[PDB]
């Protein structure tokens, strides 16, 4: 409950989600043009506490569409935070495909909170 | 592209996934029924051919018909191939928690995965 | 020259830290969570005493390690983040908590967050 | 011995450290990759009593990547814990984050893992 629906983060990127009664989540993932488009499938919560606490539940996004391919994806891993306004905190994890020498710079950290309104600024 | 089968963490933990042609990362983490999860990911369905490893992520999370630890999982990392095959991942555990608590909500580690047991 | 970053930070949480920024790369200070003795600690860390001059951060870094004369908590934070200036002055920083663990519990050690530190208390 | 000591990775970089008794960890981080050249100093801390239940010492520490030769605008921190044994081991998380304009703050910050023994790997 409370997840399905438009979700837009600080940088204005846009997670179009739905929340299956089983834990899957699926949708979409983009930033408005059919190429910046990204398939998303994940999994949450789907019998959270009673006490207060959010919803756990994460994401991936591999970044290959129809028209580019930059050969990495990004793992999303948060909870959503109900009530007045709903928000979704997490930190996400961005694998590119790297050789083996390389392999120390394969993954960038950050932090993402998403709202179901646009950011200002 | 070599992702689909059984995989085994350092650990004792046993991922069985599917690599579906659409980009689809599909199966069940353990480790019993009660020790079962469903995941869900992608991975890169065309990776370069240069020697780079795939780009791949997937979640569980850590709700079954039997348990539910109010929590979740994500992986990142890459598939590598060759005789030694490998997925080399971190990843990042969410909990459920109030406010005050969302500072110690996340726990983040490493796994890597072999296509035989430890 | 100013690195502008010796002096008082703040996080949105309660927490202060002092910091003095050294002319040859050291961060030296405390971190306090209402600033009891018994909520204050040793900060040591580096930071970049050359930055571009493109518009970019400083780097910078630092560890606490919770044990004072007082109290142990038998693990480390270290902040890894960049020094951003201007009237609004900012240091934005990843955090990695690791508390001592026996082998068997090593995957629940590391604890990962981000804080956001001003010059205002708030 | 203990955390003072030459330590190794696991794509050989050497630290060269020393535990101080009042929880200080200082030395140097000599990098086999990346925009890295020679010897870049290094601080953290450590728990100086840590506990007796057979749990590893955390420790954390930081270099910022600019020595007389070479400045990447970059710095990484390390947090981890020390497990004594037959062959013991630094075991680490570790950020490094790169001074980066505004547009470019969501790719300043790297993360990975490094595994330090007293003993050189190939």
Same mark, same amino acid.
């Not at 996004?61 to 050969?71: E, I, L, P």
């Given at each position: ?12 990127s846009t997670?179009?989600?739905? %929340?299956?009664?089983?834990?899957? $989540?699926?949708? @979409?993932?983009?930033?408005?043009? %059919?190429?910046? /488009?990204?398939?998303l499938?994940? /999994? ?10 959010? @919803?756990? $539940? ?9 028209? /580019?391919?930059?050969?990495?994806? @990004? ?11 709903? /928000?979704?905190? @997490? ?17 960038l ?13």
């Amino acid at each position: 409950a409370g997840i399905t629906g438009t979700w837009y983060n600080q940088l204005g990127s846009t997670f179009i989600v739905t %929340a299956g009664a089983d834990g899957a $989540l699926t949708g @979409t993932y983009e930033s408005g043009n %059919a190429e910046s /488009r990204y398939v998303l499938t994940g /999994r949450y919560d789907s019998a959270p506490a009673t006490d207060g606490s959010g @919803t756990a $539940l994460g994401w991936t996004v591999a970044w290959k569409n129809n028209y /580019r391919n930059a050969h990495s994806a @990004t793992t999303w891993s948060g909870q959503y935070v109900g009530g007045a306004e709903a /928000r979704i905190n @997490t930190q996400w994890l961005x694998t590119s495909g790297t050789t083996e020498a390389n392999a120390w710079k394969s993954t960038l950290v950050g932090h993402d909170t998403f709202t179901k309104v646009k950011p200002s600024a």
